Amino acid sequence: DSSRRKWNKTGHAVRAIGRLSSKFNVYIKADKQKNGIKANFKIRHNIEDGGVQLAYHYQQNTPIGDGPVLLPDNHYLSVQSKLSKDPNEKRDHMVLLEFVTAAGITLGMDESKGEELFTGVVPILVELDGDVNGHKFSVSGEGEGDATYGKLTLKFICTTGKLPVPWPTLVTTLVQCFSRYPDHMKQHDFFKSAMPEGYIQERTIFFKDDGNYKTRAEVKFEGDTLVNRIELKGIDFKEDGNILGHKLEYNTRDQLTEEQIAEFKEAFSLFDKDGDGTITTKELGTVMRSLGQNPTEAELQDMINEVDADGDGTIDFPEFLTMMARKMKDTDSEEEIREAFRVFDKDGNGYISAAELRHVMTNLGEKLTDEEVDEMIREADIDGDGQVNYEEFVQMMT
Ligand SMILES: [Ca+2]
Ligand SMILES: [Ca+2]
Ligand SMILES: [Ca+2]
Ligand SMILES: [Ca+2]
């Protein structure tokens, strides 16, 4: 089991570097000329019997009123969503709990008049009129937002009967003014600064190998209620694809196992060489270099920033756990592991020998004995040739 733990560990570190290089958040930038903002992000929709349907989002927001707004430096929003059902509700519907937090600006230490409209709980009304491939529909929703906690609680109904697209594909269209901006980032909250007059939010959402939604929404106060009024047009969908075919998973209740957390702590340790419970840009750097990469300082800083939910400048184990729960496609993961193979196979002969394995594991800070190295080789060596080929490496690293 201990040669297997060493392979487990190594596979997890290789995958961790890939995930630290991926972009899962909502990336916001200023658009000075338009007195607003742009955003881009990808949503990974789980496909019921396996796989991920990507939805590439592009976004622009512009103020409705004439007053000055806050134009942000580059940052992101991190969103966690739960979709559920009301067992009493006979209409086609969705119950949504969401938490949204601004991050991506590094404080490096542990901890608008519009903003005043958000200091407590605010009631919300949502209205959507859609047309996807000529299928006309309407959604109505109501709830509350509490921007102190970044929290949204809403129930939505399809008021025209059965919803012709899956509910998860509408979540992003169905009030980013309820994001929680940390105290060090209040100057960057464009969304609240545009209130009460509000903003227009426009998106195009490209479902890969399928159709697209284009949306236009007005988000503004009407008296004390924050209202999101939306028109959605979807075109070029496949009648048989994941959207019009209802092939998408509703809720992804999918928490990590105890063994998996156990395995992820061992991977964490391989990064956290000083043992202080944190991974710094330097520690990440050292691991990346022993795996044949040459990241710049700014690239290390960006990688940590992508997962540094608390903005303290380092990755702690909870942050690491969130990151390792990030899905990469079966075939994404794949270039990482190929790269790793080429790094392990020092002479490039297509086999990792025991001497080459030792060399790398040592540089990864496992000091192994002659026997421990042969134990690892034997574990992976399916064809018995005494060395590890690509196909055998894949088996161990996945
Ligand atoms: Ca450390
Ligand atoms: Ca952190
Ligand atoms: Ca070799
Ligand atoms: Ca072999």
UniProtKB/Swiss-Prot annotation:
Indicate the impact reported for I43V: In P9; increases fluorescence at 475 nm excitation. In R10-3; matures to the red-emitting state with excitation and emission maxima at 555 and 585 nm, respectively
Result, substituting N74S: In EBFP1.2; shifts the excitation and emission spectra to shorter wavelengths and increases quantum yields compared to BFP
Variant or mutagenesis effect after changing N25K: Increases fluorescence at warmer temperatures such as 37 degrees Celsius. In Esmerald; leads to brighter fluorescence. In VisGreen; leads to brighter fluorescence
The UniProt-reported impact of V26I is: In Azurite; shifts the excitation and emission spectra to shorter wavelengths and increases quantum yields compared to BFP
Q: In which tissues is it expressed?
A: Photocytes.
Q: What is the effect of changing E98G?
A: Suppresses the 399 nm excitation peak, leaving only the longer wavelength peak at 475 nm
Q: What happens after mutating S140R? A: In mut1.28; shifts fluorescence lifetime from 3.03 to 2.76 ns. In mut2.2; shifts fluorescence lifetime from 3.03 to 1.94 ns. In mut3.3; shifts fluorescence lifetime from 3.03 to 1.88 ns
User: Is this entry keyworded Cell inner membrane?
Assistant: no
Q: Recite the UniProt keywords alphabetically.
A: Chromophore, Luminescence, Photoprotein
Q: Which InterPro entries match?
A: GFP, GFP-related, Green_fluorescent_prot
Q: What is the effect of changing N74I?
A: In mut2.1; shifts fluorescence lifetime from 3.03 to 2.50 ns
PTM field: Contains a chromophore consisting of modified amino acid residues. Maturation of the chromophore requires nothing other than molecular oxygen.
Reported effect, Q176H: In P4; leads to no detectable fluorescence. In mut2.2; shifts fluorescence lifetime from 3.03 to 1.94 ns. In mut3.3; shifts fluorescence lifetime from 3.03 to 1.88 ns
Q: Name one GO biological process term.
A: bioluminescence
* Annotated consequence of substituting V175N: In R10-3; matures to the red-emitting state with excitation and emission maxima at 555 and 585 nm, respectively
Outcome, altering V69A: In mut1.5; shifts fluorescence lifetime from 3.03 to 2.72 ns
What use has been found for this protein in biotech? Green fluorescent protein has been engineered to produce a vast number of variously colored mutants, fusion proteins, and biosensors. Further generation of mutants led to more stable proteins (at 37 degrees Celsius for example) with brighter fluorescence and longer fluorescence lifetimes.
Subunit field text? Monomer.
Please report which protein family the annotation says this sequence is part of: Belongs to the GFP family.
User: What does this protein's UniProt record list under function?
Assistant: Energy-transfer acceptor. Its role is to transduce the blue chemiluminescence of the protein aequorin into green fluorescent light by energy transfer. Fluoresces in vivo upon receiving energy from the Ca(2+)-activated photoprotein aequorin.
Q: What is this protein called?
A: Green fluorescent protein
Q: Which gene encodes it?
A: GFP
